[PDB]
Structure formats: C-alpha cells, structure tokens
Coordinates of C-alpha atoms and ligand atoms in Angstrom, one line a residue:
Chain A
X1 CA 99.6 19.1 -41.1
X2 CA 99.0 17.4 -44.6
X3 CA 95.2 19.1 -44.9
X4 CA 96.3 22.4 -43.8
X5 CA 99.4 23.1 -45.7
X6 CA 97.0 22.6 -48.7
X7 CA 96.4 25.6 -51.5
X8 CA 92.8 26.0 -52.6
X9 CA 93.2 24.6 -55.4
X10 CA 94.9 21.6 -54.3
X11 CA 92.2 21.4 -51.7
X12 CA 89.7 21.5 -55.0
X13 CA 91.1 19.3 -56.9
X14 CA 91.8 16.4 -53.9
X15 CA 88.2 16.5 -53.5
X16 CA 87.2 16.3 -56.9
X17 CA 89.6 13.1 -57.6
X18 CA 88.3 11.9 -54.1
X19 CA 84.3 12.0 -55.5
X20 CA 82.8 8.4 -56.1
X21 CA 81.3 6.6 -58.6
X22 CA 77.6 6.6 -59.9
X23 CA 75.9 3.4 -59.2
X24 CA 73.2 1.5 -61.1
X25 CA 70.1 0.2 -59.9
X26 CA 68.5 -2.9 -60.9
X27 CA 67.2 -3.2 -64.3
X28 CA 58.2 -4.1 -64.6
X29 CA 56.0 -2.0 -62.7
X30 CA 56.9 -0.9 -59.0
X31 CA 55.7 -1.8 -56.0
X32 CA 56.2 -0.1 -52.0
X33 CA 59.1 -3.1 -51.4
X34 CA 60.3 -3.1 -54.8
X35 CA 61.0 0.4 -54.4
X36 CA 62.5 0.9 -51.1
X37 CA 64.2 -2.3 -52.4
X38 CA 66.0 -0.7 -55.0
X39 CA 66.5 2.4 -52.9
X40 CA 67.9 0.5 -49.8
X41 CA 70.2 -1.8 -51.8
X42 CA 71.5 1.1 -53.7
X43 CA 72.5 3.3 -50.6
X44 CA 73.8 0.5 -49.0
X45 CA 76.1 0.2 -52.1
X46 CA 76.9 3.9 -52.1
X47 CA 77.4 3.9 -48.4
X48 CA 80.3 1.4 -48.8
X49 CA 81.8 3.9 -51.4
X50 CA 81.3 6.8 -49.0
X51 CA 83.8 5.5 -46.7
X52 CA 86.5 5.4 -49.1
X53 CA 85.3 9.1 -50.2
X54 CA 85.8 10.2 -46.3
X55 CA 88.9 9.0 -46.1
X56 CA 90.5 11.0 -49.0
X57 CA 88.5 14.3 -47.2
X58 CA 91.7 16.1 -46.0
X59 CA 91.8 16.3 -42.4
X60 CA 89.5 13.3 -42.0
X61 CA 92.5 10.6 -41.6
X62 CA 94.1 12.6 -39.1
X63 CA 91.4 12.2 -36.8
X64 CA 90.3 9.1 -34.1
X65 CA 88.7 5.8 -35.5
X66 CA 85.8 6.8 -32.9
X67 CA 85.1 10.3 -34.4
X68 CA 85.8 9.1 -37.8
X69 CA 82.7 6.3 -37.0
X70 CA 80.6 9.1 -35.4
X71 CA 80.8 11.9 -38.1
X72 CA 79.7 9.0 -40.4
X73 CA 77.4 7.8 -38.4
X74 CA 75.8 11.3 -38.3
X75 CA 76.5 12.4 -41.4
X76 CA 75.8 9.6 -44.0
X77 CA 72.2 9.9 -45.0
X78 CA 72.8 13.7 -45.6
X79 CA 75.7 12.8 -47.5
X80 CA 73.4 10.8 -50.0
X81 CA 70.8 13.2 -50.2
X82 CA 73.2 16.3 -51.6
X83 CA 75.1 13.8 -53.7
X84 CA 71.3 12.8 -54.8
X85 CA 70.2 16.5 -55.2
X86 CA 73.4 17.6 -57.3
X87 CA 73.0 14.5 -59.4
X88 CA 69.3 15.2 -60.1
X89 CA 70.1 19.6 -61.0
X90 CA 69.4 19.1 -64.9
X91 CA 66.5 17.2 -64.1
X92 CA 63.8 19.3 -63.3
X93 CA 61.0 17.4 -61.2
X94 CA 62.9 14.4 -60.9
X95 CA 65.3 12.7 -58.7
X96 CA 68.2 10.6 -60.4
X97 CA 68.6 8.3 -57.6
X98 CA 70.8 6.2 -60.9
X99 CA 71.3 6.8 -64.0
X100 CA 68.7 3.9 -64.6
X101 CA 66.1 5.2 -61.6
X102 CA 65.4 8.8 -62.7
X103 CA 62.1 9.2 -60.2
X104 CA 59.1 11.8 -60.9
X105 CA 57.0 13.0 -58.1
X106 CA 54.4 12.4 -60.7
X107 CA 55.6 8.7 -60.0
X108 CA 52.1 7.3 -58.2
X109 CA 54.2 7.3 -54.8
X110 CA 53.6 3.7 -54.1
X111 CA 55.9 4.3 -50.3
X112 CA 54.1 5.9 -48.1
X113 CA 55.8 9.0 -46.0
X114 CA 57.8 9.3 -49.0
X115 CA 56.4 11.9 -51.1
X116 CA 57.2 15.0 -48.7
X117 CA 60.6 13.5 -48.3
X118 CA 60.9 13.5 -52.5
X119 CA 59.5 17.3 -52.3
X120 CA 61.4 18.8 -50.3
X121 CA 64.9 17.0 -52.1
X122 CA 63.0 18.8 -55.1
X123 CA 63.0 22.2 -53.9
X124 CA 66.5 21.5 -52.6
X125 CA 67.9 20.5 -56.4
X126 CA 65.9 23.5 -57.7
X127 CA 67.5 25.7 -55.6
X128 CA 70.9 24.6 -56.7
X129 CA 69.5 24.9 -60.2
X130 CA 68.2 28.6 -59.5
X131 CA 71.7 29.2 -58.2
X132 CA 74.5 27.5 -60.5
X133 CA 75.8 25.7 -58.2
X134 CA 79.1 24.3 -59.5
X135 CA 81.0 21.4 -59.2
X136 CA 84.0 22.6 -57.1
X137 CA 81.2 24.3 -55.1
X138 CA 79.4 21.1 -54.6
X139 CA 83.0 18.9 -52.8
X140 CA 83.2 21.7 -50.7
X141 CA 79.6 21.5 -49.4
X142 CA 79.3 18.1 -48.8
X143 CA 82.9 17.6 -46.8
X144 CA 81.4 20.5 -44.8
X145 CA 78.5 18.6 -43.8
X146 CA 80.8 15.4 -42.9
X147 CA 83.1 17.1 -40.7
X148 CA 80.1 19.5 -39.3
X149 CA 78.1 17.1 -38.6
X150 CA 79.2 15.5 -36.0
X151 CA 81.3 18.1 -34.4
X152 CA 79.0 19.6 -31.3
X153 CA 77.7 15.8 -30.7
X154 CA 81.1 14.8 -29.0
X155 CA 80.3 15.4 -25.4
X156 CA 83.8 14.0 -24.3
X157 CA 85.3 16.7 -21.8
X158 CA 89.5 16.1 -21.9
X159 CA 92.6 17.9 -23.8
X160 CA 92.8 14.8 -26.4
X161 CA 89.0 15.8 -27.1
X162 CA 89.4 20.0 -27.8
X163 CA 93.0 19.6 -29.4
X164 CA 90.7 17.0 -31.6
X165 CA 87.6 19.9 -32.5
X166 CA 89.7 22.7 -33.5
X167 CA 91.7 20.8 -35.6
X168 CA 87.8 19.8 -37.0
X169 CA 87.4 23.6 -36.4
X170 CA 90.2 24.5 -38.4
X171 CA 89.7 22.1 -41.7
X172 CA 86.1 23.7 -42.1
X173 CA 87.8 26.9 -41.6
X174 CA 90.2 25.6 -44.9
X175 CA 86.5 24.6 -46.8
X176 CA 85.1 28.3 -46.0
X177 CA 88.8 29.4 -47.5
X178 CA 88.5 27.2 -50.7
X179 CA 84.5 28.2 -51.1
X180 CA 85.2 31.8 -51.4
X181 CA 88.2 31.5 -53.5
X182 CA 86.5 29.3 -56.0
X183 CA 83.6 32.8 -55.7
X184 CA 86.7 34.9 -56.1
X185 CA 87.8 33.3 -59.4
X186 CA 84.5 33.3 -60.7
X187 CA 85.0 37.0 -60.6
X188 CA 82.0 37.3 -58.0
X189 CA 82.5 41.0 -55.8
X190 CA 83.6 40.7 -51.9
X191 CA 79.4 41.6 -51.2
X192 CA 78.6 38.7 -54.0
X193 CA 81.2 36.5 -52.1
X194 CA 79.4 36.5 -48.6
X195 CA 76.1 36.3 -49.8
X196 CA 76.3 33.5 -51.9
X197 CA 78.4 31.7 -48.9
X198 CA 75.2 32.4 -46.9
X199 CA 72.9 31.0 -49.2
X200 CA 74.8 28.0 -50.1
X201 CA 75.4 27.3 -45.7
X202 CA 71.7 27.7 -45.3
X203 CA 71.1 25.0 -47.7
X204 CA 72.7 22.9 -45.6
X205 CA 70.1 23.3 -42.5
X206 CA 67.8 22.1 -45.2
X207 CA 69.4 19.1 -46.0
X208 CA 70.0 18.4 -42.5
X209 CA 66.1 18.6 -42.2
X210 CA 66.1 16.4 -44.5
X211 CA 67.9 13.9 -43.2
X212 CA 66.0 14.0 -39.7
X213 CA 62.7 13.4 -41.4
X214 CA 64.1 10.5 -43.6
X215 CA 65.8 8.6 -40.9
X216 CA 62.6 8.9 -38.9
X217 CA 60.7 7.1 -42.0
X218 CA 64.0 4.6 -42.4
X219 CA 63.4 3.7 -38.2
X220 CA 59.5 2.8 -39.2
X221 CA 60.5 0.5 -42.0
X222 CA 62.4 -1.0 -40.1
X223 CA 60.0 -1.7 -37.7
X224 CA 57.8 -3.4 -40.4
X225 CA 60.3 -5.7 -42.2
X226 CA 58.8 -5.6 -45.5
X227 CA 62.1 -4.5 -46.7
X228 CA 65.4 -5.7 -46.0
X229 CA 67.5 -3.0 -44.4
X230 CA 71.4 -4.7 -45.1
X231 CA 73.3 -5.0 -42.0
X232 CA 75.5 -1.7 -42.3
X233 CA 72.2 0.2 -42.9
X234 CA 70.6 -1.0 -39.6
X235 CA 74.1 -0.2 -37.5
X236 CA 73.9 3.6 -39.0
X237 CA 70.4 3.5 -38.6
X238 CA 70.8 2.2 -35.1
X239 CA 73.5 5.4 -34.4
X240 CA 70.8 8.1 -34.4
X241 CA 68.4 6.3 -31.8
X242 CA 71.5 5.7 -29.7
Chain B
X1 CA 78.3 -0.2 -34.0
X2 CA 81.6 -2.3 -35.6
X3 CA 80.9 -2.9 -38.7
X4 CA 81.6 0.7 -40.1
X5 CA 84.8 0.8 -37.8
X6 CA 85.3 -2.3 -39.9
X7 CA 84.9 -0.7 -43.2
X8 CA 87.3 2.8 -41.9
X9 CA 90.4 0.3 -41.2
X10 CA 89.8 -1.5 -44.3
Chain C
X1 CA 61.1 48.7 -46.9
X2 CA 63.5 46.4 -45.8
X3 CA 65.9 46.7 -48.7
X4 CA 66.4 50.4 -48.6
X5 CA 67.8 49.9 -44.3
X6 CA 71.2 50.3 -44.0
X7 CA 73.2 47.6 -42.0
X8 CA 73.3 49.8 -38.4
X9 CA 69.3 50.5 -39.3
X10 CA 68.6 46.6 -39.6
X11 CA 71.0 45.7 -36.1
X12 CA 68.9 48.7 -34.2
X13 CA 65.4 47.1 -35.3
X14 CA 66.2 43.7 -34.6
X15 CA 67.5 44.5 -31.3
X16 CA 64.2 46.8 -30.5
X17 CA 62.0 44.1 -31.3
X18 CA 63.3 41.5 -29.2
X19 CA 61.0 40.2 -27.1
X20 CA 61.1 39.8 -22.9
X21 CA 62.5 37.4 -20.8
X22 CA 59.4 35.5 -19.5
X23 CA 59.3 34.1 -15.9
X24 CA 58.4 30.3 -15.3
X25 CA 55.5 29.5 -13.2
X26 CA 57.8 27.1 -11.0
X27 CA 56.6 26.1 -7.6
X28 CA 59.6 25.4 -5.5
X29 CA 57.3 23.8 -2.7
X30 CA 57.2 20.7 -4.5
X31 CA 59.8 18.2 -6.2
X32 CA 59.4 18.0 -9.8
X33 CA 58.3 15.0 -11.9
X34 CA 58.0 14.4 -15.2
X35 CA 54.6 15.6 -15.6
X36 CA 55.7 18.8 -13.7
X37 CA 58.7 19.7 -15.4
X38 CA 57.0 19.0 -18.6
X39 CA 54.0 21.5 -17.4
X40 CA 56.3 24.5 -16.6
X41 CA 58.2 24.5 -20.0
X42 CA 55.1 24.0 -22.6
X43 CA 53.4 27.3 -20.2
X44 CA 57.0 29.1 -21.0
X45 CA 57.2 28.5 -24.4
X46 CA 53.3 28.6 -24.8
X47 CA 53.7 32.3 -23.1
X48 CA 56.9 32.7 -25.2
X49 CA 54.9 32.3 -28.4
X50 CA 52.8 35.2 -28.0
X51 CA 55.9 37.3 -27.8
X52 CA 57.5 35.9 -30.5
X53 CA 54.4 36.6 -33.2
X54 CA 54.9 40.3 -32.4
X55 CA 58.6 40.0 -32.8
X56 CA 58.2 38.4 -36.1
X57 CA 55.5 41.2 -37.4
X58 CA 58.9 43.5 -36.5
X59 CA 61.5 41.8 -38.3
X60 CA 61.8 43.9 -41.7
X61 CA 60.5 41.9 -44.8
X62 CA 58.3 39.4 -43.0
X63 CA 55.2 41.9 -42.9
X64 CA 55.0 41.9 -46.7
X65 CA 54.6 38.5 -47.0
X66 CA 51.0 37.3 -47.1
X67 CA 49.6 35.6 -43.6
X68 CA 49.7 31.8 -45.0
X69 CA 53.3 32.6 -45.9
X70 CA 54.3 34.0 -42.6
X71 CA 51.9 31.1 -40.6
X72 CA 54.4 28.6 -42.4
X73 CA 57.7 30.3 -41.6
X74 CA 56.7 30.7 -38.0
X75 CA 55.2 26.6 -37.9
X76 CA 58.5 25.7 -39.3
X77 CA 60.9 27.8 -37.2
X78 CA 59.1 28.3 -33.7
X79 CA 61.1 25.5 -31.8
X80 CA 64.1 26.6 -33.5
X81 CA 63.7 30.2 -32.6
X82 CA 62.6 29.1 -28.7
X83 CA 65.6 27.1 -28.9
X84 CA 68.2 29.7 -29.8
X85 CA 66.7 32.2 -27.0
X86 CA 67.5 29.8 -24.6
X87 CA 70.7 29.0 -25.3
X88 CA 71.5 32.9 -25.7
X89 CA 70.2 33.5 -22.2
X90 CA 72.5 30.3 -20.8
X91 CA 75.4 31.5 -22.2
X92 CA 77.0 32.9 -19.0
X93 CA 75.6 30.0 -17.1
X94 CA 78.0 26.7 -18.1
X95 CA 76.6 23.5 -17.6
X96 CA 73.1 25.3 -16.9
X97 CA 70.2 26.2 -19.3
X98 CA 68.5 29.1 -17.7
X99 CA 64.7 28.3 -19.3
X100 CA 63.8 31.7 -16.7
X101 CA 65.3 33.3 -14.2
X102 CA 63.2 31.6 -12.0
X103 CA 63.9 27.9 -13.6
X104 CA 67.8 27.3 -14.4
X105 CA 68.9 24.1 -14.5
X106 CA 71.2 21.6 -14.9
X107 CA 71.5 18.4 -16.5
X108 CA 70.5 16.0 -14.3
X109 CA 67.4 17.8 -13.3
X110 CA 65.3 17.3 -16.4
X111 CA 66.5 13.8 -16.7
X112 CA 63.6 13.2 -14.8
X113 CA 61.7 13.8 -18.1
X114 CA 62.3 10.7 -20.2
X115 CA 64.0 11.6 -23.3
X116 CA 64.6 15.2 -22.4
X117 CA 68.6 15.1 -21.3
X118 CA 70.0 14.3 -25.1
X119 CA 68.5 17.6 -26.0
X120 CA 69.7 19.2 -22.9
X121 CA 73.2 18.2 -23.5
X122 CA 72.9 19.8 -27.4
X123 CA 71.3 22.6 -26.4
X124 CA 74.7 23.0 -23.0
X125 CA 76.9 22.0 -26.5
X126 CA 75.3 25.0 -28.6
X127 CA 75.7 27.5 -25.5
X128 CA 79.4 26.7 -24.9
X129 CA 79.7 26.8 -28.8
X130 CA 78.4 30.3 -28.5
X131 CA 80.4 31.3 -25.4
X132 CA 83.8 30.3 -27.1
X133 CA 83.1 31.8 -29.6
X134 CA 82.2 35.1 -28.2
X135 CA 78.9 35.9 -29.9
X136 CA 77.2 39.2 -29.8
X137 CA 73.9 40.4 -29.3
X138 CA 73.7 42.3 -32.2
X139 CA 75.0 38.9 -34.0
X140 CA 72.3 36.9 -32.2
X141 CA 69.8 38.9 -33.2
X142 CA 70.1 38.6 -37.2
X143 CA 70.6 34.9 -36.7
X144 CA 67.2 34.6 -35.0
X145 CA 65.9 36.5 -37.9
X146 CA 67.5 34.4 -40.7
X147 CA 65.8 31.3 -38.9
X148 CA 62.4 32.8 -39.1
X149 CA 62.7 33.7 -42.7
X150 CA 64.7 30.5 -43.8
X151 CA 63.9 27.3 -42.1
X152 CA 60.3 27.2 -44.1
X153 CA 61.3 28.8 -47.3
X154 CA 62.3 25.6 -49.1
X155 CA 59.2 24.2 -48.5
X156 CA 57.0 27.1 -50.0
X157 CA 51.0 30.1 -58.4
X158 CA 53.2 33.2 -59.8
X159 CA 52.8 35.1 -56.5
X160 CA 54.6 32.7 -55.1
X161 CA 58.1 32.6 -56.8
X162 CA 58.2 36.5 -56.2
X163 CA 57.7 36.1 -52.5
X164 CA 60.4 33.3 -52.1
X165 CA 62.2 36.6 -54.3
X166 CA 62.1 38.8 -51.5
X167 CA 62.6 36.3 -48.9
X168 CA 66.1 35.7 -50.3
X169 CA 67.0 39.3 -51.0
X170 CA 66.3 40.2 -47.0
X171 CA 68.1 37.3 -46.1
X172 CA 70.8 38.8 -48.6
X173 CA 70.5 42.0 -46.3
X174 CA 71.1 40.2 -43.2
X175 CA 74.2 38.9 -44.2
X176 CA 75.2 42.4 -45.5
X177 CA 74.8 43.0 -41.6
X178 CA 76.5 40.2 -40.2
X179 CA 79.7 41.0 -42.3
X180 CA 79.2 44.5 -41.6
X181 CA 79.4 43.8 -37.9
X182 CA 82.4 41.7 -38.2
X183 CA 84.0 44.4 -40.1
X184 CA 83.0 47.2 -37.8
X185 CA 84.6 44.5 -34.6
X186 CA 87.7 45.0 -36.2
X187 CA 88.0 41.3 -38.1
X188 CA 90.3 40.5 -40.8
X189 CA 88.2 39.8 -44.3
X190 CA 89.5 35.9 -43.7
X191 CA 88.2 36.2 -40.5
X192 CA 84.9 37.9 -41.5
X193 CA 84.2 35.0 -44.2
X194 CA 85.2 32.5 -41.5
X195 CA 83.1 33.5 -38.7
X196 CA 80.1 34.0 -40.7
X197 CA 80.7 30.2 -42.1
X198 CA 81.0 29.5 -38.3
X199 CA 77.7 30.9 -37.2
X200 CA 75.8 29.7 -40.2
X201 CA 76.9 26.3 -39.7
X202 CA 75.2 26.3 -36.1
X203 CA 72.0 26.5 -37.8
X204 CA 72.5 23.0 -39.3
X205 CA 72.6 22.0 -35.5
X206 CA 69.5 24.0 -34.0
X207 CA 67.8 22.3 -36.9
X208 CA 68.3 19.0 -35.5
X209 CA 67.8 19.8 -31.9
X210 CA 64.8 21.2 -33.2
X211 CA 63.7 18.1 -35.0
X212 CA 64.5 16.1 -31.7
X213 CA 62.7 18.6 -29.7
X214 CA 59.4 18.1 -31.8
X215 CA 59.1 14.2 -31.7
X216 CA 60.2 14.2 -28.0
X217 CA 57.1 16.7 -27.9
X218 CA 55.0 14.8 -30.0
X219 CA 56.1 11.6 -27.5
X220 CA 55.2 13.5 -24.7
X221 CA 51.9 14.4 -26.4
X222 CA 51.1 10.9 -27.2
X223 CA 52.1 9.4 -24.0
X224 CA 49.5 12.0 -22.2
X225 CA 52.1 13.3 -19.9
X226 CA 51.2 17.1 -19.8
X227 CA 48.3 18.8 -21.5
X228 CA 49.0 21.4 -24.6
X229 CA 47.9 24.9 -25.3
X230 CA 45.7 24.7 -28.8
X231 CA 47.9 26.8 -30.1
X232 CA 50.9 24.4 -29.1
X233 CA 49.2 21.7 -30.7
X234 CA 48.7 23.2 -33.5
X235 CA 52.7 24.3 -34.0
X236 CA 53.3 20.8 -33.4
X237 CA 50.7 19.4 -35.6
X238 CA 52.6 21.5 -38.7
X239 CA 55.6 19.0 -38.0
X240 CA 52.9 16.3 -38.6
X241 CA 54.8 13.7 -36.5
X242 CA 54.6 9.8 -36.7
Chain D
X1 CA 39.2 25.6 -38.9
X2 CA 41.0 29.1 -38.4
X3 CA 43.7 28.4 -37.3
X4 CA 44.9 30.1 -33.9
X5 CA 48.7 31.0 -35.4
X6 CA 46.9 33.2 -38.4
X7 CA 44.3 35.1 -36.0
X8 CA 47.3 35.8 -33.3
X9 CA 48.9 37.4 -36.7
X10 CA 46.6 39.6 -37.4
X11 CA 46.6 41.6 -33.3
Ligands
HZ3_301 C1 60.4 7.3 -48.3 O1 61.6 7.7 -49.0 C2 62.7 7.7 -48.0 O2 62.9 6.5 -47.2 C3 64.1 8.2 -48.5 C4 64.5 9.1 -49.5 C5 63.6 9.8 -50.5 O3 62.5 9.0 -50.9 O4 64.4 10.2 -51.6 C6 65.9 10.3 -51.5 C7 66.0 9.2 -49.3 O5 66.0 9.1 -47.9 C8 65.3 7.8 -47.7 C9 66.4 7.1 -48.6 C10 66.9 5.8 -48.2 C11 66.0 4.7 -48.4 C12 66.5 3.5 -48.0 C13 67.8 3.4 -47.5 O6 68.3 2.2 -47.1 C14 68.6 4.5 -47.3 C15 68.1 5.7 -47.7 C16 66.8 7.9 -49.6 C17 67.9 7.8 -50.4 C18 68.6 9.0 -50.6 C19 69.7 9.0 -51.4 C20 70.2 7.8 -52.0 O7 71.3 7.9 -52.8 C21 69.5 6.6 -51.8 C22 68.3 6.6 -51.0
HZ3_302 C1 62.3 18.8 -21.6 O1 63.1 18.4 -22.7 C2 62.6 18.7 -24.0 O2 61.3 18.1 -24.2 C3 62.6 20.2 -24.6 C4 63.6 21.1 -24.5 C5 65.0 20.9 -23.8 O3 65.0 19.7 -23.0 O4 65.4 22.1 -23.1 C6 66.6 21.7 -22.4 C7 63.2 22.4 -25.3 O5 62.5 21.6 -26.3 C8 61.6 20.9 -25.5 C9 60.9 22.3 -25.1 C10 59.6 22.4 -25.0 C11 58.8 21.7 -24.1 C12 57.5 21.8 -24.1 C13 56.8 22.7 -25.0 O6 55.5 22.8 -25.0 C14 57.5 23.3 -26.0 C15 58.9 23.2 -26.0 C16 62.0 23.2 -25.0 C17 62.0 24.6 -24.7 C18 63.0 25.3 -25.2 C19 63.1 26.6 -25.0 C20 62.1 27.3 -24.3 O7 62.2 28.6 -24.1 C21 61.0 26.6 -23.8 C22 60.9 25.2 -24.0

C-alpha cells in the first residue's frame, strides 16, 4: 500500500532523504594490503549504512526478512559500485572511493586483478558524465538494482512466493513511472523519454558485470588472508558461492 | 548468513 | 544504413537473419556422464557459433564497425546471446530447457554435471519470466541484437569515440522498435515504458548467468572434463578467467 | 596469432 499510493515526486524525494552518508577513509605511500585495507574497511562501513538506505526504499519493508536478506545479499556490491561511479562523475579518470581516497588508474595499481575492475567503473562514470545523469535519476537507478536483483533468484514455488514478486514487480513498475516523469519534466520528447530509459537500463547490465567480476577477485582474497575481510563482508561474500 | 538479518531487524 | 530503416524494416531484418535451430549430436544408446553431457553442449554451441557470426554480419550497424571492434562485441556477448536462444526455444517447454530438439531436458538431468544445475534453474527462471510475460518474436529478436552491440561497448584513438557514436545511435534505433512494437500490440504509453523497463531489466540477469556460465566453463576447462573447439577456447580466453 | 573469431568474420 504505503509504496504504491506514492506520487513521483514523493517517490523522488523519499529516496533522496533516504540516500546515506559519504564516508572517510583513513588518513604514506600504499601498499596491496594497505589498499584493499582501506577499501574493505570502508565498504564494510558503507555496507552497514546500506541497510538503513534499504529499508527507507518504498516497497522494501513490506517484504519478508528472507527476501529482504537475499536482495542484499545479491545486490550490495553493485550497490557500492553505482554509489562509487556517481560519486566519482566530476572526476574524470579517477574514482572517489572518499572524499580523502580520490584513486587514478595512473595510481601504480599495487592490487593485482584490480586494474580492469577500476577501468571498466571508469567507463561506467564516463558514461554517466557523457549523459547528465542527474541526481533524482541516480535514487531511481540504484533502488532498481536492489529490488531487481534478486527478483528471478527466488526459486520458491507457493502463493506466499508470487503474491511476493509482483508486488516486487509492481514497485519497479513505480521506479520506471518516476524515471520517465523526472525525463518528462526535464522537457525531454516521448522518443527522448524511451531512449534515454534504454540507455540508462543498459547501464545497469554493466554494473552487474561489474559486480560479478569483483566478487570473483573479493572470493580470491579471501582465499589469501593478507587482508582482513570483516565478518559481515565474508557472510555477503559467502551468499554468492552459496 | 545471520548477521545481515541481524542488522534488517535492527 | 542502419539509421535511415524504419522500425517494421529493422523487425523484418532481424527476424531474416536469425539463425537455425541446430540439432545435438546426442546418442541415446548410452547414459550420460559428466564428460558426456558436457561434450554434446560445447559441439552445440561450438556449431551454434558459426551461425551466430553470420547473424551478427546481418544485424544493421554492426558491419560498419571495424573487425577488432566487432571480434570484442561478439567475445563479450556470445554466452549471453547462446543463452537467450535457449531460453527462447524453452519457452513452451516449463521446467525443460530444450538445448535441441533432439536434447531437452530437465533439471535433474544435467545435475550430473557438477556445477551445471544453478545455471539451469536461472536459465528455467528467465524462460518462465519470458513465458509470463508473453514475449514476442519480433521482441526477442531486437533484444538479441541490443546484447550483441551493448554488452562489450563499455569496455571499448579518435576513431574510436565515433564508433562507440554509432553504436549508441543503433541501439537508439532498436528501442525506437521495441516501443514501436508495443505501440503497434495495442499497449497503453504506461505500459509501453513499463514493458520495455521489464525486458531491459532481464538483461541484468542474462549478464550474470552469463558470467556463471563462463567460470563454470572455465572449471570445466581446467578440470579436463571435455575437450574445447580452438575457437571455444578462444571466446573463453576473452573472459580471461582465474 | 590470428585469431579464429576475426578470420570466421571475414567469410
Ligand atoms: C581489486 O579491486 C576490487 O577488489 C574492487 C573494486 C575496485 O577496485 O574499485 C571499486 C570495488 O569492488 C572491489 C571493492 C571492494 C573491495 C573490498 C571490499 O571489502 C568490498 C568491495 C570495491 C569497492 C567498491 C565500492 C566501494 O564503495 C568500496 C569498495
Ligand atoms: C552444463 O551447464 C553449464 O555448464 C552451461 C549451460 C547451462 O547449464 O544450460 C542449462 C549453458 O552455459 C553452459 C553452456 C555451454 C557449455 C559448453 C560450452 O562449450 C559452451 C556453453 C551452455 C549453453 C547454453 C546454450 C546453448 O545453446 C549451448 C550451451
């Protein structure tokens, strides 16, 4: 009820208020641990925050503790790469991973398997860059990827588990509503409308690309234990081999 | 697989 | 050129080029193992392969682009595009993936590869998704081609930002068709935007299953289980798995 | 090497 009686604004602004926080790194030269260091303490920090974000995502509250754990549990690490990405548009050929760890790629990559992962998040932040992607356009995006996710990975079979997906099924619907009147207001044509919808959906296999390749590098450090994955970190890491 | 369902009620 | 087709011009090309359905070399006078099952599908998509080069040189736009450029998109999306197929062709088959006519099965038949039924169940997940939804040939068809000519183009001197150019003003096109379509099936403009948010979003999962596909492939490669075609080996070297 | 993809592109 509460998600769907929303207008688009009110959809807008809930997720704007809704965003979290930037967080700092640690404030000389780097090393491979000291850097996935500051990198793995710092998601673990924003993954705590994350939750709370998820929470105030309409829709989200309304579904099970079990699907609310297994969209995160898919979702999270291409959550931080988009919040990553937008954070680092202004920035061209860097990645503002804080405001106080603003990374080149002509940063002598001292993590290894790291450097195609930095490239493509690149090409990802120039693309939004290239298109102006906004703001409003941005909450949108990333509660679609949270409630997408997860959504064909729930193989349970009963009325309690369908009832569950198009409700899912009908938030996103709300998201594609509040995308194209944000386009609408910008005074973009009905043609101008779907293609930039397009575009900005497509990005989103990207990122998901993304995320495939960098929890495969996250599963090989851990296997090497020169960095300390945090506890919460190996559970969600722990998710996508389950 | 507990602490995030942890974190969600708290 | 591919910019001047109008949308029915782009649906009847698309739907010309499409490539055969291939039969499986399966041997029913034998049980399968791993090593068997694993032998029938690398020959189908190895054949498959073949077929889908000459139905990339026939989607509009891609013959312009220069043969390292279309080498890349068709590395990146091959698995992706294979993957699609299949589930198109199971769609009328629930709980089956019909590989050929010749080799449809079920779950619990390729759980005699190890690793292999997690993708099965996606790929079952993606072909209900499909059947629910009602998707249309003429549909299936432009989201086979926006695969081909988006899943590498993130990843791409001055010849080179006017070919990612043209990449994004076909894929402009092919949206221009989907909607098109939708309009022409009688949907509502809500509907239209919401369905082609719908279809777009599937992409974000035939990226992962493709991602899980390739390292179960690479496993299977490393493992010595079944041997590969050069030219398999070669797709699968592109994904440079480790 | 040549690779195979960029000669089966070119038939
Ligand atoms: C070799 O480099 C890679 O391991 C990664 C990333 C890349 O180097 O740039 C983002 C990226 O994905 C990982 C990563 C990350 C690294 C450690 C973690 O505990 C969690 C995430 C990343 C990360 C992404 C966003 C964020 O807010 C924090 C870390
Ligand atoms: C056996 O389980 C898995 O290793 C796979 C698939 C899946 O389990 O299908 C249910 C799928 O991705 C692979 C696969 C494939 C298997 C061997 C290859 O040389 C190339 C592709 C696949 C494939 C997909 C489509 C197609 O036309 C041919 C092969």
């Amino acid at each position: 009820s509460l998600a769907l009686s929303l207008t688009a604004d009110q959809m807008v602004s809930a997720l704007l208020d809704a965003e979290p926080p930037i967080l700092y790194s640690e404030y000389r030269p780097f090393s491979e641990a000291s850097m996935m260091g500051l990198l793995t303490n710092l998601a673990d920090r924003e993954l705590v925050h994350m939750i709370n974000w998820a929470k105030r995502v309409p829709g989200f509250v309304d579904l099970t503790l079990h699907d609310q754990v297994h969209l995160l549990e898919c979702a999270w690490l291409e959550i931080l790469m988009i919040g990553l990405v937008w954070r680092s548009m202004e920035h061209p050929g860097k990645l503002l991973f804080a405001p106080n760890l603003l990374l080149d790629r002509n940063q002598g990559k001292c993590v290894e398997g790291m450097v195609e992962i930095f490239d493509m998040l690149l090409a990802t932040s120039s693309r939004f860059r290239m298109m102006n992607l906004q703001g409003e356009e941005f909450v949108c995006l990333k509660s679609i990827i949270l409630l997408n996710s997860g959504v064909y990975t729930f193989l349970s079979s009963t009325l309690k588990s369908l009832e569950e997906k198009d409700h899912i099924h009908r938030v996103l619907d709300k998201i594609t509503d509040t995308l194209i009147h944000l386009m609408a207001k910008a005074g973009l044509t009905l043609q101008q409308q779907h293609q930039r919808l397009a575009q900005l959906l497509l990005i989103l296999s990207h990122i998901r690309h993304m995320s495939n390749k960098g929890m495969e590098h996250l599963y090989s450090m851990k296997c090497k234990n020169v960095v300390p994955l945090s506890d919460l970190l190996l559970e969600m890491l722990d998710a996508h081999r389950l | 697989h507990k602490i995030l369902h942890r974190l969600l009620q708290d």
